[PDB]
Amino acid sequence: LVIPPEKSDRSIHLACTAGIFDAYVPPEGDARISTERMKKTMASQVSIRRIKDYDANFKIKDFPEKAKDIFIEAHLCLNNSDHDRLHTLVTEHCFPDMTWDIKYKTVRWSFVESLEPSHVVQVRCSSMMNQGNVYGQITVRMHTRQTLAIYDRFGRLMYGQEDVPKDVLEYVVFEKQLTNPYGSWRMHTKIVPPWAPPKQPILKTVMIPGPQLKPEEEYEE
Amino acid sequence: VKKGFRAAFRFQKELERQRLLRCPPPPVRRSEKPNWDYHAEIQAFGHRLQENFSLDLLKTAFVNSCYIKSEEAKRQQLGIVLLNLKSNQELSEQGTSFSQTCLTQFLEDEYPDMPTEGIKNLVDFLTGEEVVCHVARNLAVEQLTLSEEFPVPPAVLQQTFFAVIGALLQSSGPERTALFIRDFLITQMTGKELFEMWKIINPMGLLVEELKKRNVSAPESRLTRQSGGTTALPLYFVGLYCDKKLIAEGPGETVLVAEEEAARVALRKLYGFTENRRPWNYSKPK
Amino acid sequence: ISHGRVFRRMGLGPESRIHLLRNLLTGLVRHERIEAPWARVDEMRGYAEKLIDYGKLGDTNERAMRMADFWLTEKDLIPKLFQVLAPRYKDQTGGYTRMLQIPNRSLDRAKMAVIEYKGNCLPPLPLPRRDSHLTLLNQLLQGLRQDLRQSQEA
Amino acid sequence: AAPKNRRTIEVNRCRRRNPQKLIKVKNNIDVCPECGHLKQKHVLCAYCYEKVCKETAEIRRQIGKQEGGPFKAPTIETVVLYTGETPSEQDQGKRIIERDRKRPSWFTQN
Amino acid sequence: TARGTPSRFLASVLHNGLGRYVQQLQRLSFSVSRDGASSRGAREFVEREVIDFARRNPGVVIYVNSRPCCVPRVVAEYLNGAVREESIHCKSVEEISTLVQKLADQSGLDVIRIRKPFHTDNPSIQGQWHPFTNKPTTFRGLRPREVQDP
Amino acid sequence: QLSPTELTEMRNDLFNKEKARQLSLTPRTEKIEVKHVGKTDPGTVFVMNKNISTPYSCAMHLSEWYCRKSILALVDGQPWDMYKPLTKSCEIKFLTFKDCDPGEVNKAYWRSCAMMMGCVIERAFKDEYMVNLVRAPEVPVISGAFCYDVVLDSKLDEWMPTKENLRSFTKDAHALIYKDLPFETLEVEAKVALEIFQHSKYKVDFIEEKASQNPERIVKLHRIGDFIDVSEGPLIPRTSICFQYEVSAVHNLQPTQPSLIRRFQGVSLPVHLRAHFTIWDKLLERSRKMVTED
Amino acid sequence: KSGTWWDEHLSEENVPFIKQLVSDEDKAQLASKLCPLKDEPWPI
Amino acid sequence: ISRKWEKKNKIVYPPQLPGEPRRPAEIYHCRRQIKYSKDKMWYLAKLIRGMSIDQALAQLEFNDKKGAKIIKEVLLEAQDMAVRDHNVEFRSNLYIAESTSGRGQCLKRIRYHGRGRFGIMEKVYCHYFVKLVEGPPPPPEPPKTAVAHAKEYIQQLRSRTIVHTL
Ligand SMILES: [Mg+2]
Ligand SMILES: [Mg+2]
Ligand SMILES: [Zn+2]
Numbered sequence A: 001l002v003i004p005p006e007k008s009d010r011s012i013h014l015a016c017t018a019g020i021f022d023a024y025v026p027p028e029g030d031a032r033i034s035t036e037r038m039k040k041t042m043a044s045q046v047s048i049r050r051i052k053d054y055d056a057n058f059k060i061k062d063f064p065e066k067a068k069d070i071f072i073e074a075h076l077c078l079n080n081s082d083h084d085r086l087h088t089l090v091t092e093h094c095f096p097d098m099t100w101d102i103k104y105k106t107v108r109w110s111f112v113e114s115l116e117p118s119h120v121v122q123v124r125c126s127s128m129m130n131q132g133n134v135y136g137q138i139t140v141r142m143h144t145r146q147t148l149a150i151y152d153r154f155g156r157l158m159y160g161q162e163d164v165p166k167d168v169l170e171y172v173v174f175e176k177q178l179t180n181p182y183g184s185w186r187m188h189t190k191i192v193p194p195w196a197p198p199k200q201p202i203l204k205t206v207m208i209p210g211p212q213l214k215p216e217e218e219y220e221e
Numbered sequence B: 001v002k003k004g005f006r007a008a009f010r011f012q013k014e015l016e017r018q019r020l021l022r023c024p025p026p027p028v029r030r031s032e033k034p035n036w037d038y039h040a041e042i043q044a045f046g047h048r049l050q051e052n053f054s055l056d057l058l059k060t061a062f063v064n065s066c067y068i069k070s071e072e073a074k075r076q077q078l079g080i081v082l083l084n085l086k087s088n089q090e091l092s093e094q095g096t097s098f099s100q101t102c103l104t105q106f107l108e109d110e111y112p113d114m115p116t117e118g119i120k121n122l123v124d125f126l127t128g129e130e131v132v133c134h135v136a137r138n139l140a141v142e143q144l145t146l147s148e149e150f151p152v153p154p155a156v157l158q159q160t161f162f163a164v165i166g167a168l169l170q171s172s173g174p175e176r177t178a179l180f181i182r183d184f185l186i187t188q189m190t191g192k193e194l195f196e197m198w199k200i201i202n203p204m205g206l207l208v209e210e211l212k213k214r215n216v217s218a219p220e221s222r223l224t225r226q227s228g229g230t231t232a233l234p235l236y237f238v239g240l241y242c243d244k245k246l247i248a249e250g251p252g253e254t255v256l257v258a259e260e261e262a263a264r265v266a267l268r269k270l271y272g273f274t275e276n277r278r279p280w281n282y283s284k285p286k
Numbered sequence C: 001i002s003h004g005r006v007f008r009r010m011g012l013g014p015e016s017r018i019h020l021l022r023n024l025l026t027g028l029v030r031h032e033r034i035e036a037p038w039a040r041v042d043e044m045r046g047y048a049e050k051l052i053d054y055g056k057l058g059d060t061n062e063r064a065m066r067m068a069d070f071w072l073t074e075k076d077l078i079p080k081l082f083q084v085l086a087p088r089y090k091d092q093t094g095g096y097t098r099m100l101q102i103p104n105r106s107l108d109r110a111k112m113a114v115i116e117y118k119g120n121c122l123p124p125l126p127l128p129r130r131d132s133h134l135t136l137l138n139q140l141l142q143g144l145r146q147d148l149r150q151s152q153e154a
Numbered sequence D: 001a002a003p004k005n006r007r008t009i010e011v012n013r014c015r016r017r018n019p020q021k022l023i024k025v026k027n028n029i030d031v032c033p034e035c036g037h038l039k040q041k042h043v044l045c046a047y048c049y050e051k052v053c054k055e056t057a058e059i060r061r062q063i064g065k066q067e068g069g070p071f072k073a074p075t076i077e078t079v080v081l082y083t084g085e086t087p088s089e090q091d092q093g094k095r096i097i098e099r100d101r102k103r104p105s106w107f108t109q110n
Numbered sequence E: 001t002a003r004g005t006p007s008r009f010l011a012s013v014l015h016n017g018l019g020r021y022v023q024q025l026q027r028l029s030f031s032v033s034r035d036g037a038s039s040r041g042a043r044e045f046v047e048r049e050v051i052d053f054a055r056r057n058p059g060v061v062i063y064v065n066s067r068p069c070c071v072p073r074v075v076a077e078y079l080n081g082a083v084r085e086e087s088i089h090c091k092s093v094e095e096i097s098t099l100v101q102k103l104a105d106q107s108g109l110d111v112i113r114i115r116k117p118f119h120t121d122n123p124s125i126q127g128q129w130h131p132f133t134n135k136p137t138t139f140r141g142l143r144p145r146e147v148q149d150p
Numbered sequence F: 001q002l003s004p005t006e007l008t009e010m011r012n013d014l015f016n017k018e019k020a021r022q023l024s025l026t027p028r029t030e031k032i033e034v035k036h037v038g039k040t041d042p043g044t045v046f047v048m049n050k051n052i053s054t055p056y057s058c059a060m061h062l063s064e065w066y067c068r069k070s071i072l073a074l075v076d077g078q079p080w081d082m083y084k085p086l087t088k089s090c091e092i093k094f095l096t097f098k099d100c101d102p103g104e105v106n107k108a109y110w111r112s113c114a115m116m117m118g119c120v121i122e123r124a125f126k127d128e129y130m131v132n133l134v135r136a137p138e139v140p141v142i143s144g145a146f147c148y149d150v151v152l153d154s155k156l157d158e159w160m161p162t163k164e165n166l167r168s169f170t171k172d173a174h175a176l177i178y179k180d181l182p183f184e185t186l187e188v189e190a191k192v193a194l195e196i197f198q199h200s201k202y203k204v205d206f207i208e209e210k211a212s213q214n215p216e217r218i219v220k221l222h223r224i225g226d227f228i229d230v231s232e233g234p235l236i237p238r239t240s241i242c243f244q245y246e247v248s249a250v251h252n253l254q255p256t257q258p259s260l261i262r263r264f265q266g267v268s269l270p271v272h273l274r275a276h277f278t279i280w281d282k283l284l285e286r287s288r289k290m291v292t293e294d
Numbered sequence G: 001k002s003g004t005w006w007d008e009h010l011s012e013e014n015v016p017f018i019k020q021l022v023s024d025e026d027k028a029q030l031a032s033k034l035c036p037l038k039d040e041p042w043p044i
Numbered sequence H: 001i002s003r004k005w006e007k008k009n010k011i012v013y014p015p016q017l018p019g020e021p022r023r024p025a026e027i028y029h030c031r032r033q034i035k036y037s038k039d040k041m042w043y044l045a046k047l048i049r050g051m052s053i054d055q056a057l058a059q060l061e062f063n064d065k066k067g068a069k070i071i072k073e074v075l076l077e078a079q080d081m082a083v084r085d086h087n088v089e090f091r092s093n094l095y096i097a098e099s100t101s102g103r104g105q106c107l108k109r110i111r112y113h114g115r116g117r118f119g120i121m122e123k124v125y126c127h128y129f130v131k132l133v134e135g136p137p138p139p140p141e142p143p144k145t146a147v148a149h150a151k152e153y154i155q156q157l158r159s160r161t162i163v164h165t166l
Helices: A036-054 A063-080 A083-089 A094-102 B006-022 B038-048 B055-062 B065-077 B089-110 B116-126 B129-137 B154-172 B174-184 B203-213 B255-271 C014-031 C038-057 C062-071 C077-088 C136-153 D009-016 D046-067 E040-048 E050-056 E093-105 F004-025 F055-062 F064-069 F103-122 F163-179 F190-196 F201-213 F277-287 G014-031 H005-010 H038-048 H053-061 H066-085 H146-158
Strands: A106-125 A135-151 A157-160 A166-177 A185-191 A206-208 B220-227 B235-241 B246-252 C033-037 C097-102 C112-117 D029-031 D038-040 D078-082 D095-099 E025-032 E061-066 E073-078 E083-087 F031-036 F045-049 F072-075 F078-080 F090-095 F132-135 F146-151 F184-189 F218-224 F227-230 F242-252 F261-270 H026-034 H094-103 H107-112 H118-123 H126-134
Touching (some): A135 A185, A206 F055, B154 B174, B203 B255, B220 B255, B246 B255, C014 C033, C014 C038, C014 C062, C038 C112, D029 H053, D046 D095, E025 E040, E025 E093, E040 E093, F055 F064, F103 F132, H026 H066, H038 H066
Antiparallel strands (some): E073 E083, F031 F045, F072 F090, F218 F227, H107 H118
């Protein structure tokens, strides 16, 4: 399935990329705060210009407000499994990650408050005409209180709690197809910092099986 | 593939009956179903019962507090006063009080020998949820009842039934309402045994006290009949004798059971609730 | 009726039975441990025990040499019988072999047994071991034994 | 002799589902202490027996290499010696079959 | 057949007729096509018969619904909750009148085998027979061949 | 003072209250990593819930065989009840009656059989007579019987149980086995235990000795049904483990002048090691002889 | 629920001891009955 | 052909209320087109009904029939699937709620007889269905005791009416 038939004039039309052009590493201890600065900013300004080229009426200041709306509405689709609307709000790279593991699960998610205003940390653009397509990725920082309760196929609480809000610091990356006349801004992926605190523990106990040894084999620590 | 449409259509109808039978749909209020006109249904209700109800009072009797509080919540949810709807609480209290006093008068006149405890238990059975709900459901009260929850809770249905009695009392007066209570609640005693409605314990203890009140000697238990004493299916007839005179006799599978049954038989005779007592007179009052 | 019939009916008849058993015994002498159907191993086990007794007579006993010549189809094993196997059991009067049931054969679900000459150089079979003397039951019986011995000496 | 009438499913179910025809539950299954795999009380553990056979086969292949032909059985006893071991005083005069592995723990040197 | 069908005992709804008689028919729902030929007899019943039938039965709410239909039907509902649907396809006006009157007179209980052609809650006034009813008593209740005062 | 029925209700409430308190200390669902160090299933790691998950829950992750055969747990080299919640990341091994050295399992089974005897003795005598539980002496298994020291009422100072009476105690023990009650454990501070057993002088003295031995003065409490007692060590999971159980003899200990302590004795075997009728009878005879703890 | 037999759980040391113990009791019981007339016989 | 058994693991129940009892997990697994008789397979499926997952695996491991290995293979993947995809905490906490065999699609072949006569031979295939329910295996029914018989007999005596009269 990796490649369609050979020697075909028609090709697959991709609307998204698979990865981040230049991954934004957040400064350590960013959660605590809750020369190089200029160099990164200059790269963002250059990339912003090619974003305003194809779309003249673009405002960086308005995006963090728009990004929050896209984010909240995308996660609300998970609650009612509104996949048709979700494809408009997220890219094809993000859609499998969001929905694959919850196909036979009930997700109750809600947005409570935004602790800190969203800040466009980085703006970057793809190499021109990868295949005739140019993409623009805007990384945004979100510090908000959310509530998540996931239930299993049998309606039994599997993760989280349905009423307790907890703080979430996550840098959501968005992506648009500038060349496409109908392209829009769509949640593309999430940056997970290495220093990010560990997630809350699951409810059930787990067993990690040891090596299954054939008779000839012997167990070595 | 065979030509035609009729056979296919007929089979579709059967496939839909089986589908419904496999998954019976959740029941809904009759008002929600087609062919319903509330005003027409209210008027027919009175006419069936041959009662000249006041349509204003009768409609209020069906309105319950739960339906009013929920109706207001829906209004708030839709961001929509005109809902000054009076509940049936006042009518319910009036009807409940009248029914208890009226039933107490009917039963005191008919059985003058029953103590107040016995008559109270009979009134509690006749006005209890089980009896009242049965009568209400079979008189279309549940269909006309405006409630928050369906099926109507038994307590709500009982309250509505007595509200209708309250409406009748205001509309037609006590005499006409007394006939209604006679014809729909007193009739519920038909076939019932005394101690099937009045649940008592230690009948022998109650019997001894009653005979003391009557200045009669304590009853002596004696074995009148016996069969199969040593078998797994004995028959015993125990007779209760007062001054060596047989007041009652009861059968049983054991002497203890037979003796207890004999005490119940003696109580039924003392209170006038014998199986062969004069039936209740439902004839038009002269 | 088969009262007191001590031999099994296998193979194609009496001669074939001996030949079948002889091939099993020849394999056992060479390899010192073989697996075969349980009934056939049980039948051959008696012959494998007696072969050692003939080996103990020595290679100079002409009767023993004729017996070994018949039963060992591979002649290099006859020196092994007289000079390796029989000397190993010089200090025993019997019990030269051990027979244990193994799981049923995969193809035909035949009941199977492993047989070996004791004292071989091969990896030891997972022999069935009795419960430790330290178990609850064995300790209660040790106490009972101790007590009885003390009462007898008195 | 042919069946004079068809046998009903009611009759057949009685014959087929009779307790005699059913599979009997086994009460002699126990866990093997050495490996933890299930075994029957009177039968050697399959897992342990297979492990022993695998080592036996390896040793037998080594014996073949030393013999190097048919009808070459030795006239002396044999001792299997694993890596890092040398013949003992009691192993003198015995053909030494060397195995290129560490001595198995269950295999005890004698 | 009786063994192949359910049965019930003769009964009434809320002891009907004991204190007063209450008509059990509570609602009638007609579905008469405007143009269907099968509904011709049902249309004539709605023009002259249904109005006079409603005057006589004020406790029955009749719902006449004119809509396209190939099979006109009348649905009868009773106070006990029973629902009965009877087709009036190609029936004459007189036939429909008879059917509608029959529905008015029925209690709504299942039209199935009735075990007994009568019912009573008080079958006995003098005491139900038992094996000792007609037996004489004996002095000191002595049993057959029983030695007293031994 | 409190009636016998009320005394149990008081002690159970205190026991339950302390159990609830320790459960609250647990923060949400913290996770511990328990590594399996047994010979079989080597290398299995259990990610369990601190202060809730017990060794039995780890056996349930493996197979039913572990649950049925595992009588005691070895947690970081220390014997651990199967139903005692695990408190830290540790190594775990499972012990059976048929291990090469089942000494610890024998002691655990041995101590539990004595605790079941205490339960029946306390609930056997008529309410008239007073039964005062003293202690369960730690006697080696080779002694042939487990023993439990009791003090009876002064009225029963010349009474010795009859054979039918001894059989009555046995029938009560077998009823406890039939009930299949778990051995619930609680490690509480001396103060909590002293409140539970305030009415009994012997338990207070016994409780004090155990607290003194340990620096943190935590005492081990066990409960089966409505009977609570103080123990010397880990117990078996359930009473259904016992198959052969008989109260064999009651001896009067000497000196009798201060108080007449009656040593009740019994012998039992688990389902895993049940003995033949003939062999069992021989064990009953030796069990009836007096044992002198050394 | 698994079946057991008398020496299933007995150790190597205890099997000979148990055999000797039960064997001696059988012999002693048989020897104790060799004098019926000295042990309260029934009327002859 | 029908394949409804595979669609029963796709039913999502709604979230349970706080006071409702925890619903047991149900895992449906099957193997299709096994070269083996359904009649012979029925006996093995019958054996393990009501058994715990571990007891069923033990009984099948030491059975001599070919179907035993196939069922054991299916049971093991069902047990793995129960923990991996169905939020079953303990893999041992499973029991056989349902186990049955079905007829598969079979093939017809000729079997030759003497005198030029023939028969039609069916190459038989079957299906195996299993349902695993989370929890301890349900206890067996106690044999109806004498007390129960006497109580039932007396109950029938007491329900006995005078027939064909008032
Ligand atoms: Mg043959
Ligand atoms: Mg031919
Ligand atoms: Zn093994």
